[PDB]
Write a protein that binds this ligand. Structure first.
Ligand SMILES: O=C(O)c1cccnc1
Ligand SMILES: O=C(O)c1cccnc1
Ligand SMILES: O=C(O)c1cccnc1
Ligand SMILES: O=C(O)c1cccnc1
Lengths: 191, 191
């Protein structure tokens, strides 16, 4: 069993200068104790939009389709409120038949701009997948931008390599972070 | 058995004016005879780059990773030449374990800017999938842009709805057309 080292390595998508400003946040929110047979990754996406514009989208646990690809539908409770412990039933059209992903809201901090979720059921999902997303505001000479960090820990399926597990999960997260950046940059350019 | 109607409907991503200029091309290259249990779709993507810049990328049958997502690797023959009938073995990391997709080059027309392929083997692939991609140059008041059309026909898996089959395939094609547009627009902005 070891502690992940995401705070010691510049993630793809981030400059070293930005990283040095985020060291304590990555230590606090994007560190995991991982066992053999588990892997973990940290991904970053720069967004030319204000933090609260990005956070308003990121934080909608009931509307993953607004920032993620391959979401056919998402159902929550009749009296769903945005509280830790809530679940969502996502139908993912990344293959046929569409898969069910039952996901738990693990963290929601509107002050610190932190959220995260765990896959707790469904079919054809990653085993023991948990992720955390944080949103960070940057300024330089009056210019403003945002950095989104997203990390996960996941079990490596027996019969699969850690290399492929990481390649799959990284590709999904990165593509969704790119959708997040497009959606929020459009809102920023337009509103 | 019917003939598809893609030439009578403006596809998503295309203006009616552009469509009226492409009617004969869609009839020629993007029409299929479909049987019950089959479905077909036409997708469009506008690209702010010259046709030959787009075609140079689109036409590389041996390098799908340059315009498509979730491609872990692509292997061709030792003396692979870009000829109809050639095959490629693509490793697709859209899930675990990665899938093998064996694909046949069906069409390659460098004059008309037409290509297409068929899935002829592998695992966890669509059954009877065939697609055709065409690239078209547009001009207006000196300004130049490109339109890429991509259509497919595919079998609807027994147990799946045509709605979900079309949603899956459309999402993949559209996302890859978006990567094509980013890659070629970057080349255009830079070269
Ligand atoms: O199987 C594929 O080709 C595929 C599945 C999901 C996402 N992208 C590609
Ligand atoms: O965030 C997701 O939904 C996700 C991320 C990685 C892999 N599979 C799903
Ligand atoms: O299973 C998923 O969440 C998934 C798989 C491929 C592509 N996008 C998402
Ligand atoms: O072009 C592809 O590789 C493709 C398109 C739709 C569905 N699956 C794969």
């Amino acid at each position: 069993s070891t502690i992940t080292t995401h705070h010691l390595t510049v993630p793809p998508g981030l400059t070293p200068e930005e990283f040095q400003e985020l060291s304590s946040s990555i230590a606090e929110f994007h560190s995991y104790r991982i066992n053999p047979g588990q892997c973990s990754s940290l991904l970053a996406q720069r967004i030319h939009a204000p933090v609260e514009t990005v956070w308003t989208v990121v934080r909608r646990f009931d509307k993953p389709q607004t920032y993620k690809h391959f979401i056919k539908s998402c159902s929550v409770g009749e009296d769903f409120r945005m509280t830790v412990g809530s679940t969502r039933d996502v139908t993912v059209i990344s293959g046929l038949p569409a898969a069910t992903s039952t996901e738990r809201l693990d963290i929601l901090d509107d002050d610190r701009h932190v959220t995260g979720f765990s896959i707790i059921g469904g079919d054809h999902r990653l085993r023991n997948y948990r992720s955390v997303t944080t949103v960070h505001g940057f300024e330089r000479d009056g210019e403003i931008w945002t950095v989104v960090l997203e990390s996960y820990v996941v079990d490596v399926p027996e019969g699969n390599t850690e290399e492929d597990t990481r390649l799959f999960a990284d590709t999904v997260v990165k593509l969704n972070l790119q959708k997040l950046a497009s959606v929020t940059e459009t809102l920023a350019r337009e509103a």
